[PDB]
């Protein structure tokens, strides 16, 4: 969305091209190029031509979901809604929500041309997006690209406070870092691991 | 108490002599000598002469305390009563007593000749006996004599289950023994410590 000389807002769609040949680092650079040039009025005619698929974000303002229109030339448009708690939880305590294990959600929509795309394909597409945003391999690939030294947080169900108390478990974590934490420390100025030597276990 | 040929029981007092020159090991030997010889009828006239102070045990049967008689020649007689719970707790659960922190008690009496011993002396005597049976130095001396390798249990008040939970504290004790327990193990066939070398800390 770029404002005009008069003042009236007018949305136009610009394209990130050849996206099937990019890693996350390359993708992030390409994205921020389009946003940069738009803010200083340096987009050309070629930037607005050749779009295959589109993305919209009603969730910015706080809309829960939308049913948008599809422009001629394309097959699908994807929409991203709000990342808040549901309205039935918007007056509850942080303490009570933390006890139960209530998370935030995002709603995603797919609007498609029925002459060329069938409903089973559209459902399978949204199922793959759901799996990726909770998948170990997906978050490993992003961390690798951005040079984050730690292991990513993994997806799991909340466990009950039975057997060994959770306070005992937090004290055992403090001992582990004080004893074995040097095994994952940013000590090597090269990104080098000697292939001959054996790697110690650091699951602790 | 030795039974006669007829069957009728008849108590007589035998003496452990020169007791002010003995350690606990020597004392235990002298005691068991008198008890042994009595059971096989080999006490002499000299064993029954020269008693200065006496000890009686009504607590054996379960009496709580007694006011006994003093025989001519001596100045005091000491009596030891029952080592049970009080009668008001004799129908309570082991669980409820353990929660509160209720211990067992022993009652001790002193019967003295008032022409030579005053009441203040008799009270000070019973206060010293109370202190000794809870004292660190007393139990160190007994353990040393009998060759017990561990430190004795010490006297303390029950502490509340606040701050770090007691379950966390029991798990830290298991880790201590698995790591540092070799420092107090029965590994040396001599009772030898090299005086030159420094002794490691094993308070853990």
Curated annotation (Swiss-Prot), chains A, B:
Active site per database record: 114 (proton acceptor)
UniProt superkingdom: Bacteria
Effect after changing residue 118 to D: Slight reduction in E2 succinyltransferase activity and in E1 dehydrogenase activity
Disrupted-gene phenotype: Strains lacking this gene completely lack 2-oxoglutarate dehydrogenase activity. Deletion of odhA also causes L-glutamate overproduction and accumulation during growth.
Additional facts recorded: Is non-lipoylated. In contrast, the E2 component AceF is the prominent lipoylated protein in C.glutamicum.
Family: In the N-terminal section; belongs to the alpha-ketoglutarate dehydrogenase family. In the C-terminal section; belongs to the 2-oxoacid dehydrogenase family.
Function in brief: Catalyzes the E1 and E2 reactions as part of 2-oxoglutarate dehydrogenase (ODH) activity, to convert 2-oxoglutarate to succinyl-CoA and CO(2). OdhA has reductase activity with 2-oxoglutarate but does not react with pyruvate, and also displays transsuccinylase but no transacetylase activity. Since OdhA is not lipoylated, the succinyltransferase activity of its E2 domain is dependent on lipoyl residues of the acetyltransferase AceF.
Subunit structure: Homodimer. Part of an unusual ODH/PDH supercomplex, consisting of AceE (E1), AceF (E2), and Lpd (E3) together with OdhA (E1+E2). Interacts with the FHA domain of unphosphorylated OdhI via its C-terminal dehydrogenase domain.
Domain free text: OdhA is a fusion protein with two major domains exhibiting structural features of an E1 and E2 protein, and a short sequence stretch of E1 localized at the N-terminus, which is connected by a linker region to the rest of the protein. Deletion of individual parts of odhA show that all parts of odhA are required for a functional tricarboxylic acid cycle in C.glutamicum; the ODH activity is in fact completely abolished in each of these mutants, and the PDH activity is significantly reduced, which could indicate that the overall structure of the supercomplex is disturbed.
Name of this chain's protein: 2-oxoglutarate dehydrogenase E1/E2 component
Source organism of this protein record: Corynebacterium glutamicum (strain ATCC 13032 / DSM 20300 / JCM 1318 / BCRC 11384 / CCUG 27702 / LMG 3730 / NBRC 12168 / NCIMB 10025 / NRRL B-2784 / 534)
């Amino acid at each position: 969305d770029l404002p005009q000389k008069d003042g009236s807002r007018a949305l136009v769609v610009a394209a990130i091209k050849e996206t099937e040949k990019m890693n996350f680092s390359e993708f992030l650079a390409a994205y921020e190029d389009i946003v940069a040039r738009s803010r200083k009025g340096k987009l050309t005619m070629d930037d607005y031509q050749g779009v295959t698929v589109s993305l919209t974000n009603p969730g910015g303002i706080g809309t829960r979901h939308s049913v948008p229109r599809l422009t001629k030339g394309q097959g699908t448009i994807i929409g991203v809604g709000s990342m808040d708690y549901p309205a039935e939880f918007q007056g509850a305590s942080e303490d009570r929500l933390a006890e139960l294990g209530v998370g935030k959600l995002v709603t995603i929509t797919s609007t498609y041309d029925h002459r060329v795309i069938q409903g089973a394909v559209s459902g399978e597409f949204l199922r793959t997006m759901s799996r990726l945003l909770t998948d170990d391999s997906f978050w490993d690939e992003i961390f690798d690209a951005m040079n984050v030294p730690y292991t990513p947080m993994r997806w799991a169900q909340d466990v009950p406070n039975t057997g060994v108390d959770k306070n005992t478990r937090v004290m055992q974590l403090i001992e582990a870092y004080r004893s074995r934490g040097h095994l994952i420390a940013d000590t090597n100025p090269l990104s080098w691991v000697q292939p001959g030597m054996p790697v110690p276990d650091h699951r602790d």
